[PDB]
Design a protein around this ligand. Structure first.
Ligand SMILES: CCCCCCCCCCCCCCCCCC(=O)OC[C@H](COP(=O)([O-])OCC(O)COP(=O)([O-])OC[C@@H](COC(=O)CCCCCCCCCCCCCCCCC)OC(=O)CCCCCCCCCCCCCCCCC)OC(=O)CCCCCCCCCCCCCCCCC
Ligand code: BCL
Ligand code: BCL
Ligand code: BCL
Ligand SMILES: CC[C@H]1c2cc3[nH]c4c(c3C)C(=O)[C@H](C(=O)OC)c4c3nc(cc4[nH]c(cc(n2)[C@@H]1C)c(C(C)=O)c4C)[C@@H](C)[C@@H]3CCC(=O)OC/C=C(\C)CCC[C@H](C)CCC[C@H](C)CCCC(C)C
Ligand SMILES: CC[C@H]1c2cc3[nH]c4c(c3C)C(=O)[C@H](C(=O)OC)c4c3nc(cc4[nH]c(cc(n2)[C@@H]1C)c(C(C)=O)c4C)[C@@H](C)[C@@H]3CCC(=O)OC/C=C(\C)CCC[C@H](C)CCC[C@H](C)CCCC(C)C
Ligand SMILES: CC(C)=CCC/C(C)=C\CC/C(C)=C/CC/C(C)=C/CC/C(C)=C/CC/C(C)=C\CC/C(C)=C/CC/C(C)=C/CC1=C(C)C(=O)c2ccccc2C1=O
Ligand SMILES: COC(C)(C)C/C=C/C(C)=C/C=C/C(C)=C/C=C/C(C)=C/C=C\C=C(C)\C=C\C=C(C)\C=C\C=C(C)\C=C\CC(C)(C)OC
Ligand code: HEM
Ligand SMILES: CCCCCCCCCCCCCCCC(=O)OC[C@H](CO)OC(=O)CCCCCCCCCCCCCCC
Ligand SMILES: CCCCCCCCCCCC[N+](C)(C)[O-]
Ligand SMILES: [Ca+2]
Ligand SMILES: [Ca+2]
Ligand SMILES: [Ca+2]
Ligand SMILES: [Fe+3]
Ligand SMILES: [Mg+2]
Lengths: 311, 318, 277, 62, 43, 259, 64, 54
């Protein structure tokens, strides 16, 4: 039970009831849990370059030593503040790559740099930072693996649904929408776009899979369906909101992250970073947004770090 | 204040009524009737006896098999954990076959158990329908209840049998579960473009709303004139008293027209029956002759248009 | 005209307000003071609905298609204040007219009940329908903090409102009060068909049969389900089921938004998080 | 002014007045809880969260 | 035995017995049809 | 077979239109069943034409249907024709739609809330043919439930709190075991009159029956039954209607208005 | 503080008061224990101390 | 420890107390076992100890 009034944001036309309801005290608690980190002071311009000073810099080679040092200090705060600088380095040998965290984090830099430059249809100049997912933790708090579901008898084929799961906001919908949609590229659309039947053979069961994905999307952003849809026509882009267009690119963006960045790193990662099916911890909508319509409620951290953009 | 005839203040006990005698060759009614005091405060105190004939017995056996199969598969779905069964009970269900099987019989855990539960439940419902037909016939009564039950059965068959057969897939049918069949209901509307725009869904709601309207009107009306013995509706129908006159006159003065003590039950019967008749028809039209109800409404000028204050760029149209 | 047995019941008095001034009949209708007030409340509300249709959302979207006619409430930005007539203010006046018409209709039924010397169950039952309407357009909008939370006045547009409000909680079927309200609605429809069938099957028996008795009614459902509620109590039960459905529907919508902002399935996390499992 | 108690039942007047005052008190307390300025349940040392770097508590709407 | 029919109604018992046997027969055929190894209505 | 009948017509559109034709036919049927009671209507339209115009509206009346009453009590036609009846009242004003003022004492006028039809002058019978509404003195196997207070011996008070009598006996429905009437011994002339249970508010703590309908002095004029141990359908309506008139006629303040 | 508090049992039934008190105390006791188990701070079974000796040796599903 | 405590059975029905006590203790016993089984530390069936057969 909550107490009224909520903070309501109207998205659609009056009387159409396309609105976002926020409990102000729950929203206050969420914001305090999604605060950004103050940017480090700007590095001194000029000075020695990374290329002619450091030995094994393969991604950040376009920077100066001052900005490179500032970047390493920042990613230490963002990823491994408790473990310190030695979490991703062999002690006494910075250039050494003989530690899996160094290899993973180098690929993570390419992930962030590609995101901040090639996925502005989604991250729209806000960009991402190592902190957006990690939030000061070496393992991001909100990651997913392919879920086998509840245990089944050996001779029972799992349905993957009909089981209360927080992944689908505690409904009985198919509890693992991440694998077919946020890692694989299964078709999300299920609704026929003609008045009369014209060959759309999509099963009703496939609508429950899309519904399960949409429950996870809305839970990840802390929004309801009307944040992006007019529920009287879920298929219709003309009656949708601009956030639906952003979410469309986000789905492709997450697939790009999981397929091209997380999956190739599977061999490097230890067994503790993998699910029961052997897949690594992967990125979902919750990984960045963590219950907010924008990660860190729209805080702009990436623009203060030129190392996080492609050259 | 004035006695509202909502609860029976003083109950009177008489020897339990065995029932109107049934014709020769009928099984005796089973059960020794008892008298619940609290049941007598709101209604009749006597519980029992019940008639359990051959048809009722067969319906019980078929019905239990369906319920047992459903419950067993629910328990299997939580890997036999009875504690997890209770926790997830509302979320548990027996899923219909996967779409790739069409109308064929899949393995047990891939929809085979669902078909058996669906068939056994259907047989028990049909057997229960025969039982309602025979009980009315044994008492010399008409078959209005059987007709109304058949209407409800028609909608039930449309949900789980007729429409899935028309679609050529058992995956279109309803899962056996509390929350799963609600997920099916929501997914059905989503999949076929907002069932709100199905005109037979609109009619079904009008009659479901009308059923609550009529029973509220009729129930309050009879309680309002129960001080004149209005609850004795058979006597009022055969020999119209002041209760039936005042009831009819109230509604004539209120809305300009009225029913009789008998015809109000024809309005009641048809409103309830049309709820599931239109429900069944609207289900049969969905996916078979209409793919998207909202687009069907647009085609027929039913869906309202709103000013375009918010819009999304279509990423497929590039 | 009047029913062939009606003239002996047309008596003066029983009015709550107005006395002899408005105590008369127009055709079959009794008017009274609240019939006059209710008629002109309804007349103004209907005429403003037609005028709202005449101006429409705008000139290009204006339509007289009865399905597409829609009078929308104000934007939420107006809060609980009055809005301009073409920006939701018409909806606010129509809502006031609707409340006036519904209450006048209920109060006119009270005067008719007093004339006939019958119980006041009917106006009492109608008050539940009015209360459900008041929750939709007054109580919930006030709790939410804006008149724009009321549903628009349109045959199909108020269905779009119900759809979008339902999906503001991502899966509205999991609303516990909604589930209880639906149970009463479905049970009421079942109980109405049973009651209508039993009365019709007894007063219209098999061919060449006499009208059955109350024993046949009690015996019939005892033979089927083992219990008969009784001729009087089925009307209590039908009234209770119908009013409980509306009461719990009013609860279900007033807790959606004011007293609950998350998805409705998440509400059941209290049960899932019990330490028993 | 004993005339009031000649025309109004003391038991019903007190039940009505007590219910009215209790309902009025509950309503006014809630009216203060609605306004965050007078919402004492936020704590005496309540400080609103600071939004920096372009943060917005609510998504943009209409 | 034989006195079992002095406590069991032969009329009620046979219908219950035949109904159970019919349900059991239907159930087993359904299970075999569900089994790909024993479904006799395939190629 | 396709979903499209023409470029614009489709199966769903034909099906909904098919329903409207059925629904229109159904409403006509139901309205025809509604008009089996109280038709043809009584109107100044008929009165001014000397019965030449029958007011039935649309749909017109249906053919008479037969109810064969059990125990050969007769066959009653629903769309019957009743003899003209004269009301015991005069119009307050001559314009059509004006109400009527009851003549004489309103409680004894048999008009308005005290009006009642003349039902059949025979008792309602159980399935076996015994009278249904009988006092507990002849329904010996009937008894008050143990947890409920026995109405016998309770004091009956009127609208004003004045004692009207005591409950001498309880009348019960034999077919459905419920209380129908309280036989009240009037403490003014020692004549027992029936009090319908619908006008009775039990006060269990004080063993008192409160009758808000009428005053204590009005119990002397309650219609009485020919046979002390059974009541006909005719007399049931007369008793209930008399109490109903009290809801409008017992006090001057009950005629209204509040303001 | 009340010398004649024993007169309360002339108004309220001793058996119904005892039944209600025992029923209400039991429900209150269950509720408080359930509330404490619901919290991470006062859950005495999952708080770690006395240094739980059970190992979760299995690939975890982080989203659930 | 009130010496005159046996008079409680003059107030509450001994049979109804025994039925309620046995019903409550069984439900309480089931509830506590369920609470322990839902925890990782005190689930004596899934804690591995002793050894690991499966
Ligand atoms: C699928 C669900 C949805 C379906 C669509 C539903 C759409 C909505 C339906 C709306 C229905 C409105 C009915 C209004 C009745 C008005 C009174 C009246 O005259 O009744 C006429 C008629 C009976 O006429 P009558 O009483 O025999 O005629 C008397 C003499 O003709 C008397 O002679 P006369 O010369 O007086 O006759 C003139 C008559 C002429 O009437 C008409 O022309 C017909 C009017 C309705 C069309 O008008 C009058 O009698 C009134 C006189 C003028 C006064 C008017 C102003 C009153 C002011 C006082 C108000 C105080 C407040 O009653 C109806 O037609 C009722 C139709 C019911 C339709 C129900 C469908 C909806 C429910 C479906 C679900 C339920 C379950 C179904 C299974
Ligand atoms: C592996 C799968 C095999 C197969 C292997 C078997 C095996 C093994 C058995 C059957 C049996 C049966 N099979 Mg086969 N069967 C197959 C495919 C079919 C198909 C089909 C369309 O494919 C059909 C319609 C059937 C039908 C039947 C029934 C004739 C019979 C079950 C009757 C029953 O349950 O009585 C129960 C229901 C009742 C109502 C019982 C009451 C009987 C009557 C009403 C009373 C008569 C009294 C009388 C004196 C007693 C003798 C009765 C005899 C049946 C004549 N099988 C495939 C090819 N089938 C069973 C059988 O042979 O039973 C006789 C059996 O053991
Ligand atoms: C996606 C949408 C969601 C959903 C979102 C909502 C929302 C939002 C609401 C409901 C409400 C309801 N839902 Mg839901 N609901 C869903 C699915 C369902 C399903 C189903 C089979 O899936 C069912 C059976 C229901 C059933 C219900 C009811 C419990 C309730 C509507 C009845 C009511 O409120 O009476 C109330 C009756 C009235 C308000 C009528 C008022 C009558 C007035 C007083 C008289 C008017 C007179 C008139 C003008 C006369 C004209 C004159 C003519 C000439 C006659 N919902 C889906 C999952 N649901 C509503 C509710 O509970 O409201 C209280 C509500 O707001
Ligand atoms: C940490 C988890 C431990 C565990 C720790 C405990 C602890 C601690 C307790 C139990 C208790 C019980 N455990 Mg254990 N228990 C475990 C695993 C199990 C398993 C299992 C499948 O793993 C089962 C079936 C049980 C079952 C039981 C029951 C035998 C008993 C619950 C009694 C009850 O519910 O009161 C219902 C009883 C009634 C309603 C009536 C009882 C009164 C009767 C009439 C009087 C009997 C008197 C006396 C007992 C008889 C003996 C006479 C002597 C001479 C005195 N435990 C695991 C290994 N278990 C409880 C117990 O021992 O209760 C006795 C208890 O305190
Ligand atoms: C007009 C439309 C409405 C309607 C009408 C309607 N329903 C009806 C009827 C009618 C007219 C009946 O006559 C029929 C009835 O009997 O009513 C009392 C019925 C009925 N509607 C019912 C339910 C129902 N109706 C619903 C809806 C509606 N019914 C509509 C709103 C719904 C909803 C909304 O979901 C439900 C759930 C049933 C109560 C009843 C039909 C019952 C039936 O068919 O039962 C079949 C038998 C079983 C399932 C038995 C299983 C249970 C046993 C206890 C199992 C155990 C037995 C034994 C111990 C086994 C032993 C071991 C074995 C191995 C032998
Ligand atoms: C509470 C239990 C159920 C119930 C009971 C009930 N309804 C009742 C009664 C009772 C007991 C009456 O006595 C009363 C009556 O007279 O019935 C014939 C009535 C009634 N219930 C009605 C309708 C109705 N009831 C509904 C529901 C219910 N009524 C509940 C389910 C619904 C639904 C669910 O939608 C409707 C549409 C009427 C037929 C009647 C009340 C008539 C009335 O109030 O007349 C005055 C008004 C007018 C003559 C015209 C309207 C004037 C307005 C200013 C217009 C604007 C209205 C609205 C704001 C916009 C349009 C709505 C949009 C959604 C399209
Ligand atoms: C064409 C034209 C002139 C348009 C102009 C329109 C304009 C400008 C204005 C019109 C709007 C205005 C001002 C309206 C004013 C008020 C008016 C006239 C209201 C009309 C009355 C009205 C709302 C009627 C609607 C009735 C409807 C549709 C449904 C009611 C529910 C329903 C289905 C009832 C049918 C079943 C019946 C008759 C139930 C009553 C009934 C019950 C319930 C019993 O239990 C009972 C028991 C024993 C005997 C009899 C009865 C009995 O008759
Ligand atoms: C005492 O009970 C015990 C403990 C033994 C077992 C307990 C079991 C329990 C707890 C069961 C609980 C069950 C619940 C909660 C069920 C909920 C069910 C719901 C909500 C169902 C809702 C809708 C379901 C529908 C509409 C299903 C319709 C299905 C139909 C009409 C199927 C028809 C199928 C047919 C005719 C099959 C044909 C099969 C063909 C291929 C011929 O077969 C070969
Ligand atoms: C440049 C900034 C980043 C750095 C330095 C960084 C660093 C790392 C490191 C060192 C690991 C391995 C940690 C371990 O296995 O213990 C890792 C894993 C991971 N990172 Fe990042 N990361 C960055 C940005 C991101 C972003 C933006 C996302 C989200 C899209 C992300 C998601 C993940 C995920 C899902 C894993 C796998 C879980 C895990 O192995 O712990 N990271 N990151
Ligand atoms: C005057 C009495 C009310 C005083 C307070 C003003 C209104 C605020 C109510 C309480 C708000 C609050 O903080 O509640 C928190 C908890 C947590 O809320 C609940 O549990 C209430 C859930 C909703 C119950 C109904 C509320 C009333 C709405 C109208 C209901 C109408 C029903 C009948 C319709 C015919
Ligand atoms: C009540 C069902 C009426 C018959 C519906 C039959 C539809 C199933 C599909 C039949 C034709 C299948 N196929 C693939 C040959 O087109
Ligand atoms: Ca959340
Ligand atoms: Ca501990
Ligand atoms: Ca162990
Ligand atoms: Fe009835
Ligand atoms: Mg499902």
């Amino acid at each position: 039970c909550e107490r009224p009034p909520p903070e309501v944001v109207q998205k659609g036309y009056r009387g159409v009831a396309m609105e976002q309801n926020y409990n102000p005290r729950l929203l206050e608690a969420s914001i305090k849990a999604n605060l950004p980190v103050e940017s480090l002071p700007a590095a001194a311009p000029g000075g020695p370059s990374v290329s002619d000073v450091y030995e094994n810099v393969q991604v950040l080679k376009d920077l100066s030593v001052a900005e490179f040092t500032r970047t390493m200090v920042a990613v230490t705060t963002w990823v491994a503040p408790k473990e310190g600088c030695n979490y991703c380095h062999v002690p006494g040998n910075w250039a050494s790559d003989d530690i899996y965290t160094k290899v993973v984090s180098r690929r993570m830099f390419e992930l962030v740099r590609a995101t901040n430059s090639n996925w502005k249809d989604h991250v729209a100049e806000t960009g991402v930072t190592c902190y957006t997912c990690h939030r000061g933790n070496p393992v991001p708090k909100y990651v997913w693996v392919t879920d086998p579901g509840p245990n089944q008898p050996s001779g029972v084929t799992p349905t993957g649904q009909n089981y209360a799961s927080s992944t689908v906001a505690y409904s009985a919908l198919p509890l693992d929408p991440y694998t077919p949609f946020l890692d694989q590229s299964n078709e999300i659309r299920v609704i026929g776009q003609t008045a009369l039947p014209a060959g759309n053979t999509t099963s009703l069961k496939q609508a429950e899979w899309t519904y399960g994905l949409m429950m996870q999307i809305s839970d990840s952003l802390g929004v309801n369906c009307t944040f992006c849809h007019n529920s009287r026509s879920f298929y219709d882009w003309k009656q949708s909101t601009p956030q639906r267009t952003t979410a469309w690119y986000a789905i492709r963006h997450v697939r790009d992250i999981n397929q091209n960045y997380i999956w190739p790193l599977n061999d490097a990662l230890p067994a503790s970073r993998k699910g029961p099916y052997g897949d690594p911890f992967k990125v979902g909508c919750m990984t960045c947004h963590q219950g907010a319509y924008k990660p860190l409620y729209g805080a702009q951290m990436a623009k203060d770090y030129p190392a996080l953009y492609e050259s | 204040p004035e006695y509202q005839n909502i609860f029976t203040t003083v109950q009177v006990r008489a020897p339990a009524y065995p029932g109107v005698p049934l014709p020769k060759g009928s099984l005796p009614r089973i059960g020794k009737p008892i008298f619940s005091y609290w049941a007598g405060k709101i209604g009749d105190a006597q519980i029992g006896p019940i008639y359990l004939g051959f048809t009722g017995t067969l319906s019980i056996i078929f019905g239990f098999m369906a319920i047992f199969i459903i419950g067993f598969n629910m328990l299997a779905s939580v890997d036999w954990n009875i504690i997890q069964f209770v926790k997830h009970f509302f979320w548990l269900g027996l899923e219909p076959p996967a779409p790739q099987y069409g109308l064929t019989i899949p393995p047990l855990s891939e929809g085979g158990w669902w078909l058996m539960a669906g068939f056994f439940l259907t047989m028990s419902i049909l057997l229960w329908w025969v039982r309602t037909y025979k009980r009315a016939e044994a008492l010399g009564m008409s078959q209005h209840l059987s007709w109304a039950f058949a209407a409800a059965i028609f909608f039930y068959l449309s949900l789980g049998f007729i429409r899935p057969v028309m679609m050529g897939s058992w995956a279109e049918a309803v899962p056996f579960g509390i929350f799963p069949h609600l997920d099916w209901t929501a997914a059905f509307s989503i999949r076929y473009g907002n069932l709100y725009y199905n005109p037979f869904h609109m009619l079904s709601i009008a009659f479901l709303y009308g059923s609550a309207l009529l029973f509220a009107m009729h129930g309050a009306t009879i309680l309002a004139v129960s001080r004149f013995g209005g609850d004795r509706e058979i006597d009022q129908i055969t020999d119209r008293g002041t209760a039936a006159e005042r009831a009819a006159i109230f509604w004539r003065w209120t809305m300009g027209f009225n029913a009789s003590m008998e015809s109000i039950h024809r309005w009641a019967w048809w409103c309830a029956v049309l709820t599931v008749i239109t429900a069944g028809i609207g289900i049969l039209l969905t996916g078979t002759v209409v793919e998207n109800w909202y687009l069907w409404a647009i085609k027929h000028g039913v869906a309202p248009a709103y000013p375009e204050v918010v819009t999304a760029v279509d990423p497929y149209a590039t | 005209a009047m029913l062939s047995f009606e003239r002996k019941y047309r008596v003066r008095g029983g009015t709550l307000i107005g006395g002899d001034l408005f105590d008369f009949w127009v055709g079959p209708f009794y008017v009274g003071f609240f019939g006059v007030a209710g008629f002109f409340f309804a007349l103004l509300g209907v005429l403003l609905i037609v005028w709202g249709a005449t101006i429409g959302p705008n000139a290009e979207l204006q339509t007289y298609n009865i399905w597409q006619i829609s009078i929308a409430p104000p934007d939420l930005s107006y809060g609980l204040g009055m809005a301009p007539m073409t920006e939701g203010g018409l909806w606010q006046i129509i809502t006031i007219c609707a409340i006036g018409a519904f209450v006048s209709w209920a109060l006119r039924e009270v005067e008719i009940c007093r004339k006939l010397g019958i119980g006041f169950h009917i106006p009492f039952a109608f008050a539940f329908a009015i209360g459900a309407y008041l929750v939709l357009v007054v109580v919930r909008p006030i709790l939410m903090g804006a008149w724009g939370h009321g549903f628009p006045y349109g045959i199909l547009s108020h269905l779009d409102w119900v759809s979008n409000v339902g999906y503001q909680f991502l899966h509205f079927h999991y609303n516990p009060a909604h589930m209880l309200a639906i149970t009463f609605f479905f049970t009421n429809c079942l109980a109405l068909s049973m009651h209508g069938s039993l009365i019709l099957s007894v007063t219209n028996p098999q061919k060449g049969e006499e009208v059955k008795t109350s024993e046949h009614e009690n015996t019939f459902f005892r033979d089927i389900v083992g219990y008969s509620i009784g001729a009087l109590a089925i009307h209590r039960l039908g009234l209770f089921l119908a009013l409980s459905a509306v009461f719990w529907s009013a609860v279900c919508i007033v807790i959606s938004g004011p007293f609950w902002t998350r998805g409705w399935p998440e509400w059941w996390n209290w049960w899932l998080e019990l330490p028993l499992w | 002014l004993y005339k009031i108690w000649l025309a109004f039942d003391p038991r019903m007047a007190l039940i009505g007045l007590g219910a009215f005052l209790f309902a009025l008190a509950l309503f006014i307390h809630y009216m203060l809880l609605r306004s965050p300025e007078f919402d004492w349940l936020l704590g005496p040392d309540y400080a609103p969260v600071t939004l920096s770097a372009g943060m917005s508590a609510l998504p943009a709407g209409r | 035995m034989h006195k079992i029919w002095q406590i069991f109604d032969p009329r009620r018992t046979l219908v219950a017995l035949f109904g159970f046997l019919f349900v059991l027969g239907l159930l087993i055929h359904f299970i075999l049809l569900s089994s790909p190894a024993f479904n006799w209505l395939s190629g | 077979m396709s979903a499209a009948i023409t470029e614009y017509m489709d199966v769903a559109q034909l099906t909904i239109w098919a329903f409207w034709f059925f629904f229109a036919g159904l409403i006509i049927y139901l309205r025809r069943e509604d008009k089996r009671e109280g038709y043809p209507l009584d109107s100044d339209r008929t009165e001014r034409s000397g019965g030449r115009v029958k007011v039935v509206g649309f749909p017109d009346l249906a053919e008479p249907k037969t109810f064969v009453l059990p125990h050969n009590a007769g066959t009653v036609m629903a769309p019957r024709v009743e003899a003209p009846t004269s009301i015991n009242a005069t119009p307050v004003a001559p314009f059509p739609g004006a109400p009527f003022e009851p003549n004489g004492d309103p409680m004894l006028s048999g008009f308005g809330p005290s009006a009642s039809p003349d039902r059949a002058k025979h008792c309602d019978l159980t399935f076996e043919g015994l009278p249904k509404i009988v006092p507990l003195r002849v329904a010996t196997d009937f008894s008050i439930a143990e947890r409920d207070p026995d109405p016998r011996g309770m004091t009956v008070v009127g609208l004003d709190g004045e004692v009207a009598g005591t409950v001498s006996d309880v009348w019960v429905d034999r077919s459905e075991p419920q209380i129908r009437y309280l036989e009240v011994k009037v403490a003014a002339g020692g004549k027992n009159v029936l009090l319908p249970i619908g006008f009775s508010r039990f006060d269990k703590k004080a063993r008192k029956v409160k009758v808000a309908a009428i005053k204590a002095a009005h119990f002397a004029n309650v219609p009485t039954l020919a046979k002390p141990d059974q009541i006909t359908l005719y007399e049931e309506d007369k008793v209930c209607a008399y109490y109903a008139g009290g809801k409008l006629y017992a006090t001057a303040e009950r005629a209204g208005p509040l303001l | 503080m009340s010398p004649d508090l024993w007169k309360i049992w002339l108004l309220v039934d001793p058996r119904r008061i005892l039944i209600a008190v025992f029923a209400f105390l039991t429900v209150l006791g269950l509720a408080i224990h359930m509330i404490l188990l619901s919290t991470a701070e006062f859950n005495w079974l999952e708080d770690g101390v006395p240094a739980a000796t059970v190992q979760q040796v299995t690939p975890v599903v982080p989203q659930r």
